[PDB]
Design a protein around this ligand. Structure first.
Ligand SMILES: COc1ccc(Cl)cc1C(=O)NCCc1ccc(S(=O)(=O)NC(=O)NC2CCCCC2)cc1
Ligand SMILES: Nc1ncnc2c1ncn2[C@@H]1O[C@H](COP(=O)(O)OP(=O)(O)OP(=O)(O)O)[C@@H](O)[C@H]1O
Lengths: 19, 1422
């Protein structure tokens, strides 16, 4: 029962824009 | 019969000091008491004086440390002699407990030796902090004294002929060489630092990394116990609760992890390999060999700790097997066989077969498993993070040499290389996190399968075949999961771009009453993404299902086989519970091994990506060019040859040439960024290069302040900046943005215009104080003529008082035959580079004469409005029912094993099958309910967010930027769609397993809860301080890796500008500062996670100690029957990694529920209610074709706070009289143009519409029949018929009338589609007159009588004339208009007009000629 211990790396094309 | 030291048997006959003083077996133990109390009674005054002086002055207590030589092996010898002294205490209690007396000479020397060794390391630590080595003379004379006394005891054991058969002989020989070997460590200190007997002491200083002022991350220089248990974190982590964690509060970082240092080490590795080997590239295998060669010296260390953690992991279920086997069979003997000299020596089989001794051995095995496992995690993490440092710097070094060719840069844009830095290097970093797993997790599984066969038998191999066929099922489900996530995410990218194109034109789409129809064009794309998200939810329920129903089916198949199918060896409760605890220690690596295999495949692909990048074509290794050859492909076809031109200092060369005749190629060939085949480059600034200023045809600006893109990392003076801001016309340019010299200019910030960006680039060229200045056509796009003339005259003037060369290469032939030393490139070659009179001799002059609050408010609001109680009840009920069943399946195993060892047995096996069936069935129900509730959650929140952002005023879009609305739309919908439900299943499993486990521990041992309550308080405070620190370091992680990938975008885009200035080294340091601020934020997040995990897991180890001690005590006497006791111990081991998961998943749920708190906060902005307060069809006509809207004193406000603008304007538009009404552009032009459409707060007055009530009209219908045009036009992407009339979509023949008779007929009929083609993201190269063409199209089709107009921002003169001809057609076909035009010199053609400056009725001219005759109206027209 561990999700952060799993592969946290995922695809990120869009990013945080601003503000 | 008092407390005798020796035996009180035989009337104190063991005190008979005859037959030698030392041959009395109790006097040798009396000698061993002497050196230990010697050290205590000589080192208590030292330590208390030391402790008092920290209670007087403790400011410098975190200043400077120097470990003595031989420090790490000092500490590991103290730990393992502490381990064997606990063993001699265990041997001593178990040996003296067989006689009538007390016999204290078996466990008084070992007990005082334990406290002496602890005080001899506290003394060593209080003397390692303070460099005063002459005061550990006392400690070395202690170790030689204590070695002599156990040497006495050991040689008398050999003379009494014990031998290695009895236990205390073996232990004493082991700890004789212990004190001997660290005595030898002590004389190493004497030898190296030379303090005691040597005439000149060698004196060392603390290292430079410690002696720096701000270094908080002091983990590479601290003693071994603080490296193991993260004690240094405390003063950091407890500080984080008072003051928040700013980037100054984090460390600088130590030398061993600085990005420059790891880059040096990695480059040494590459250079050594490519010299010794015959590899021509530094290709894939070269990089792969180099990383291992540079970082294997740490990665092998992490694997070593991981293997030792695996073996000490299996000393958990082995200890359960020994405890429960001895707890069965009546506890019969409990006494030792051997009797040497009247003293009983415990046989080693009776030692490691005892109950409490094996329990304390279990406790000490967990305190080493669960500390080597954490040291293994962190060393793997820290070496992985130093890869991120060195590989980003390596990638950026080969950005600083990449050619801007059509083959190197012509293949991969900056989006490829930004995704390269982000996605590629992070998954290469994640491979070096998981690298000890592929070395150890096979040894874990193999030793797991082997000793699970020794415990139970071949039925355990059927069970091990089930779980070893639960790794490929997890792999294929994860493969289908990644496919579904891939398709879903690259689909929602298109949805987010469509939402960006529907939320950027908010005013334009609201003007034509098109917020509802464009919301529908978003909602269709959303439901396609919703189908993809449902497939994501299916494939992630089965991962939860397999994780929580492969072990239960494994256990069910195991024991049903062993009893029904096998009938070989009946339980034996010790066998059953040892097998259960082995299954849990095997279930953890198996699902994670699927993720390891995935990371290995991606790592090989990633080094392939980074190898083809790293070995692509480089660039190369006053002005004068002889040979004239310059190409882009590195052989053949020079794209600009025969260039024989010289331009020395003291010059301002205006250049000329044909359209696309090698102009920018000629300038860049002087810049040294083209592979010049044949020719030489003499170069001397008034062969090496000076800092050539440059500004390309395409502009470029760093995403920063407008002064930062102007000064460009150079010092700043007010005089030259004011002169450059005046000469380049920048004070209107700074005021054109709402902040000027503080606004984030350029991309990622304030969206500029093309003329503004071209002028900003020219400003950076002049200011940077350079021995040349290149302007590659600055006056090409800037159609403001006098700006270019003042720039031309000002460039000549500024450089003439500076005496530095300039070169402007464009076609602006207004100056080129006058006063330059010009050079003309015809057909890609140089003709003549001389004076203007030479161009008066070669027939070329003819053209120039032509808080820190948390969940429960936001979490309650999330769970209520998203889920619905008809599934919220099913989710909570199924989780609690499944976990009562899991308590039941474990407890049924316990009750059946007790009644099977003391011998309805098939009834027990049958009910075990019907409890295992409920286990698998309830886990499927919970796995479906969690993900299904999350899927429905995302559906209703997205429609609410879209509708409330639609049903909003345009005034809110003035207040908050588009960046804020788009961010908390797109990224927070991703978090509440694919990250919160999985975290919810993991959290609702983790905290419920913990409550389950502590209820069971308290059930077997009701003594535990008295020792749970202080333990739960300590667990609570550790949980509290970790949340405060982990949240702040998480935001510090996110907002630091953002500016770094921003830097990799801003470098690769404007590459040639950076290599022009020879100012590459300053940007090299900007990366290294960014990479250090990223790695130190990442390392504090890692080390705070390990501090939580070490501290909560030691709490779990104390759970094991208290639970095992009280359980065996209550089963020796109170007769627990040992079925429950095994059921007690197999959950005490599982507490230690459920408290870990509870606190960590709670922190992740905190940060992710914060992204639903913000969506609710943005749903709390509602205004502009469609309030039609009449009979809404009787208030308007079919379509208002009067155009007779007499505005009656409509006074305006926005916030209704301090200053209305409009005053008493009692002005009417007559039917026909297309009143072009321009005014003051500063006060009453733009405000009135917005408020004309009932899109502002008209707090009083009367806003009539053909004499009817326009305050109680349907605002959809009211914003339908009154068309407009705009100033900064934008085309919403879609069909061309959707670009004409999406709400109507009437007919093609109406579009034929529109796209022919309005404008753009030779573009529409020459388009490939016609009226039914896809508008490719705005019509990227269509026209500016398509704005006016769409205006006339919407004005004739949408029954639009009125047409409120605004002026063109940038247009052509014939385009303005075509708009004027269409305006003549607009009065001829629509008959109503009220136009304001900021192009004031052309707006005079009207019927009636009013100039209303500073909010009044100042000028009125009902004939147009009366304005030009009077005083005040003419002065605004002159
Ligand atoms: C705890 O996992 C495991 C459990 C069991 C097994 Cl057989 C293997 C592992 C495992 O995966 N061993 C790899 C090493 C590892 C992975 C994840 C984690 S962690 O708990 O997610 N801590 C962090 O990630 N810190 C991050 C690091 C990246 C930048 C930001 C801070 C900690 C260490
Ligand atoms: N950096 C480059 N990358 C790829 N191709 C280039 C580059 N520079 C020049 N070329 C090629 O060389 C030829 C000559 O380009 P030239 O220098 O005339 O452009 P330019 O005339 O300065 O641009 P513009 O006409 O917009 O001012 C072009 O056809 C172009 O394809």
């Amino acid at each position: 029962m561990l999700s952060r211990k799993g592969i946290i790396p995922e695809e990120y094309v869009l990013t945080r824009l601003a503000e | 019969m008092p407390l005798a030291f020796c035996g009180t048997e035989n009337h104190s006959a063991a005190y008979r000091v005859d037959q030698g003083v030392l041959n009395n077996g109790c006097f040798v133990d009396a000698l061993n008491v002497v050196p230990h109390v010697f050290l205590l009674f000589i080192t208590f005054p030292i330590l208390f004086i030391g402790w008092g002086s920290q209670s007087s002055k403790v400011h410098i207590h975190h200043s400077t440390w120097l470990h003595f030589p031989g420090h790490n092996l000092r500490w590991i010898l103290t730990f393992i002699l502490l381990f064997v002294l606990v063993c001699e205490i265990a041997e001593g209690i178990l040996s003296d407990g067989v006689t009538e007396s007390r016999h204290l000479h078996l466990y008084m020397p070992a007990g005082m030796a334990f406290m002496a060794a602890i005080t001899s390391v506290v003394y060593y630590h209080n003397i390692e902090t303070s460099n005063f080595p002459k005061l550990l003379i006392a400690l070395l004379i202690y170790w030689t004294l204590a070695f002599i006394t156990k040497t006495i005891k050991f040689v008398k054991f050999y003379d009494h002929a014990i031998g290695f058969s009895q236990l205390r002989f073996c232990l004493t020989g082991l700890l004789v060489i212990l004190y001997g070997m660290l005595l030898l460590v002590e004389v190493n200190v004497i030898r190296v630092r030379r303090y005691i007997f040597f005439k000149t002491p060698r004196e060392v200083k603390p290292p430079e990394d410690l002696q720096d002022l701000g270094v908080r991350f002091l983990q590479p220089f601290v003693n071994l116990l603080s490296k193991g248990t993260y004690w240094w974190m405390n003063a950091f982590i407890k500080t984080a609760h008072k003051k928040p964690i700013d980037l100054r509060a984090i460390a600088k970082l130590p030398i061993a992890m600085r990005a420059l240092t790891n880059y040096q080490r990695l480059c040494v590795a590459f250079d050594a390999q490519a010299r010794k080997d015959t590899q021509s590239p530094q290709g894939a295998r070269a990089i792969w060999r180099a990383l291992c060669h540079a970082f294997g010296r740490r990665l092998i260390l992490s694997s070593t700790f991981r293997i030792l953690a695996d073996l000490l992991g299996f000393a958990g279920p082995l200890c359960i097997f020994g405890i429960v086997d001895h707890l069965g069979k009546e506890n019969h003997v409990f006494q030792p066989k051997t009797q040497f000299l009247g003293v009983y020596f415990v046989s080693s089989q009776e030692f490691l077969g005892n109950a409490y001794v094996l329990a304390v051995l279990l406790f000490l095995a967990l305190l080493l498993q669960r500390t080597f496992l954490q040291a293994s995690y962190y060393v793997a993490i820290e070496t992985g993070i130093n890869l991120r440092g060195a590989i980003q710097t390596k990638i950026y070094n080969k950005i600083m040499h990449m050619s801007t060719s059509n083959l190197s840069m012509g293949e991969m844009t900056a989006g490829q290389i930004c995704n390269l830095v982000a996605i590629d290097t992070n998954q290469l970093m994640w491979f070096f996190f998981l690298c000890p797993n592929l070395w150890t997790m096979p040894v874990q599984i193999i030793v797991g399968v082997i000793l699970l066969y020794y415990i139970l038998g071949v039925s355990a191999l059927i069970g091990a075949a089930v779980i070893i066929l639960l790794a490929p099922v997890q792999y294929f489900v994860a493969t289908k999961l990644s496919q579904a996530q891939r398709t879903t995410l690259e689909h929602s990218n298109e949805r987010l771009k469509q939402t960006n194109e529907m939320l950027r034109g908010m005013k334009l789409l609201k003007l034509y009453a098109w917020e509802s129809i464009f919301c529908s064009r978003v909602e269709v794309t959303r439901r396609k993404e919703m189908t993809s998200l449902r497939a994501f939810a299916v494939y992630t329920s089965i991962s939860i299902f397999m994780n929580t129903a492969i072990p239960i089916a494994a256990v069910l198949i195991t024991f049903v086989g062993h009893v029904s199918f096998f009938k070989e060896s009946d339980l034996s409760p010790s066998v059953a519970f040892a097998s259960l605890s082995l299954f849990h220690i095997l279930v953890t690596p198996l699902f994670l091994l699927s993720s390891v295999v995935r990371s290995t495949v991606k790592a090989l692909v990633s080094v392939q990506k980074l190898s083809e990048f790293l070995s692509s074509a480089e660039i190369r290794e006053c002005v004068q060019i002889i040979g004239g050859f310059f190409t882009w492909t590195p052989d053949g076809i020079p794209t600009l040859s025969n260039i024989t031109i010289r331009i020395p200092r003291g010059q301002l060369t205006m250049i000329v040439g044909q359209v696309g005749c090698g102009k920018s190629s000629l300038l860049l060939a002087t810049l040294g960024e083209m592979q010049k085949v044949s020719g030489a480059v003499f170069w001397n600034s008034n062969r090496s290069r000076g800092p050539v200023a440059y500004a390309s045809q395409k502009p470029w600006l760093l995403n920063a302040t407008v002064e930062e893109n102007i000064t460009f990392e150079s010092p700043f003076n007010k005089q030259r900046y004011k002169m450059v801001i005046e000469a380049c016309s920048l004070q209107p340019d700074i005021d054109i943005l709402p902040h000027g010299d503080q606004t984030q200019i350029g991309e990622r910030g304030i969206n500029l215009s093309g003329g503004q960006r071209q002028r900003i680039s020219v400003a950076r060229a002049l200011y940077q104080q350079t021995n040349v200045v290149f302007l590659d056509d600055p006056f090409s796009a800037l159609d403001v003529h006098l700006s270019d003339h003042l720039m031309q005259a000002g460039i000549l003037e500024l450089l003439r008082d500076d005496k530095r060369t300039v070169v402007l290469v464009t076609h602006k032939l207004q100056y080129l035959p006058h006063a330059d030393w010009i050079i003309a490139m015809k057909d890609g070659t140089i003709q003549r580079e001389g004076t203007l009179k030479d161009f008066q001799r070669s027939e070329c002059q003819l053209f120039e004469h032509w808080q820190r609050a948390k969940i429960p408010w936001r979490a309650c609001t999330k769970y209520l409005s998203s889920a619905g109680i008809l599934l919220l009840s099913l989710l909570v009920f199924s989780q609690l029912l499944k976990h009562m069943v899991l308590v039941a399946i474990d407890y049924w195993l316990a009750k059946w094993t007790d009644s099977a060892l003391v011998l309805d047995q098939s009834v027990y096996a049958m009910v075990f099958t019907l409890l295992c069936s409920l286990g698998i069935v309830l886990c499927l129900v919970t796995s479906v309910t969690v993900e299904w509730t999350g899927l429905k959650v995302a559906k209703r929140l997205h429609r609410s967010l879209l509708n409330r952002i639609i049903l909003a005023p345009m005034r809110f879009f003035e207040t908050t930027p588009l960046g804020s609305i788009l961010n908390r739309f797109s990224s927070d919908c991703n978090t509440i769609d694919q990250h919160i439900p999985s975290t919810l299943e993991c959290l609702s499993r983790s905290t419920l397993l913990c409550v389950s486990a502590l209820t069971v521990i308290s059930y077997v041992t009701p003594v535990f809860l008295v020792a749970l309550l202080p333990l739960a308080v300590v667990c609570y405070f550790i949980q509290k301080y970790f949340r405060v620190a982990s949240r702040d370091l998480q935001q510090l992680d996110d907002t630091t890796q953002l500016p770094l990938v921003s830097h990799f975008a801003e470098t690769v885009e404007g590459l040639t500008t950076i290599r022009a200035f020879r100012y590459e080294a300053r940007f090299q340091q900007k990366l290294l500062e960014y990479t250090d601020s990223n790695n130190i934020a990442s390392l504090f997040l890692t080390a705070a996670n390990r501090w939580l995990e070490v501290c909560m897991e030691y709490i779990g180890a104390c759970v094991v100690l208290i639970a095992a001690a009280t359980s065996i005590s209550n089963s020796l006497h109170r007769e627990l029957s040992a079925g429950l006791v095994g059921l007690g111990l197999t959950y005490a081991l599982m507490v230690s990694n459920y408290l870990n998961w509870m606190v960590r998943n709670l922190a992740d749920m905190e940060i992710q529920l914060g992204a639903v708190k913000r969506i609710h906060a943005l749903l709390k902005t509602e205004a502009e209610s469609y309030e039609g307060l009449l009979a809404p069809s009787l208030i308007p006509k079919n379509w208002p074709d009067q155009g007779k809207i007499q505005i009656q004193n409509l006074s305006v406000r926005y916030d209704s706070s301090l200053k209305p603008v409009l005053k008493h304007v009692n002005t009417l538009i007559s039917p026909g009289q297309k009143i072009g009404i321009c005014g003051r552009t500063g006060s009453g032009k733009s405000s009135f143009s917005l408020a004309f459409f009932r899109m502002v707060d008209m707090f009083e007055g009367r806003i009539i519409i053909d004499g009817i009530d326009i305050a109680k009209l349907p605002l959809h219908t009211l914003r339908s029949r009154l068309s407009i045009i705009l100033q900064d036009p934008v085309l919403f992407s879609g069909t061309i018929r959707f670009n004409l009339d999406p709400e109507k979509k009437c007919s093609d023949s109406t579009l034929w009338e529109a796209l022919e008779i309005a404008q753009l007929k030779l573009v529409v009929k020459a388009l490939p589609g016609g009226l039914d083609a896809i508008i490719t993201e705005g019509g990227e190269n269509f026209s500016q007159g398509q704005r006016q063409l769409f205006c006339l199209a919407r004005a004739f089709v949408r029954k639009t009588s009125i047409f409120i107009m605004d002026e063109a921002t940038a247009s052509i003169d014939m385009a303005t004339e075509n708009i004027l001809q269409k305006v003549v057609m607009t009065a001829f076909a629509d008959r109503t208009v009220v136009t304001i035009a900021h192009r004031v010199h052309t707006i005079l053609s009207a019927d009636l007009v009013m100039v209303l400056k500073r909010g009044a009725i100042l000028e009125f001219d009902k004939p147009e000629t009366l304005l030009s005759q009077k005083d005040s109206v003419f002065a605004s027209f002159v």
